[PDB]
């Protein structure tokens, strides 16, 4: 009832493996590649690119500054998939739980990035995270055009 599901897949003209490795290993590169959207990525715990690593994001949605604390819950090297779990931040004001999965198709001539949100809302009249999805899409376009 309160749980929901959001998926968006976009093609990328950039290299799919590079794109995947950024989200696994090199989140820190994101803030230079999309400075409007993300001001900073801090590794709070663990090593970059491992399940259990904990991370702090400073970002801006609709020109309003926000922060998130994520744990990497799963990684699958075969499908090139990284799962992030939000445990603190502004989104936890609206949603009880929120998961984000980035999964990158690389084996084919056309490469794509798929984004999947799995969430549970605190109340029925909480909005769908469309603003969060467009934002992930903007980021993907920036990484893609960075070269």
The footprint of Cl ion (CB under 5 A) covers: 50-51
Q: Which residues of 92-127 are buried (b: 16+ CB within 10 A; e: fewer)?
A: eeebeebbbbbbbbbeeeebbbebbbbbebeeeebe
Least distance (Å) between residue 51 CB and Cl ion: 4
Neighbours of 12 (CB within 10 A): 20
Which residues lie below 8 Å from residue 45, measured CB to CB, with a gap of 6+? 52, 53, 54
Judged by beta carbon, residue 25 or residue 28, the one nearer Cl ion is 25
Judged by beta carbon, residue 20 or residue 119, the one nearer Cl ion is 20
**Pairwise CA distance, residues 64 & 53, whole Å:** 26
Judged by beta carbon, residue 26 or residue 58, the one nearer Cl ion is 26
Least distance (Å) between residue 113 CB and Cl ion: 20
Judged by beta carbon, residue 36 or residue 51, the one nearer Cl ion is 51
């Amino acid at each position: 009832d309160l749980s929901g599901k959001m998926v968006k897949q976009v093609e990328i003209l950039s290299d799919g493996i590079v794109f995947y490795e950024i989200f696994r290993y090199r989140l820190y590169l994101i803030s230079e590649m999309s400075p409007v959207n993300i001001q900073g990525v801090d590794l709070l715990e663990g090593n970059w690119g491992t399940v259990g690593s904990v991370i702090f994001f400073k970002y801006t949605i609709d020109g309003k500054e926000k922060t998130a604390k994520d744990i990497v819950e799963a990684i699958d090297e075969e499908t090139k998939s990284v799962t992030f779990k939000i445990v603190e931040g502004d989104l936890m004001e609206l949603y009880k739980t929120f998961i984000i999965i980035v999964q990158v198709d690389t084996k084919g001539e056309h490469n794509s990035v798929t984004w999947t949100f799995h969430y549970e809302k605190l109340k029925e009249d909480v909005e769908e995270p469309n603003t969060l999805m467009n934002f992930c899409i903007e980021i993907t376009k920036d990484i893609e055009t960075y070269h």
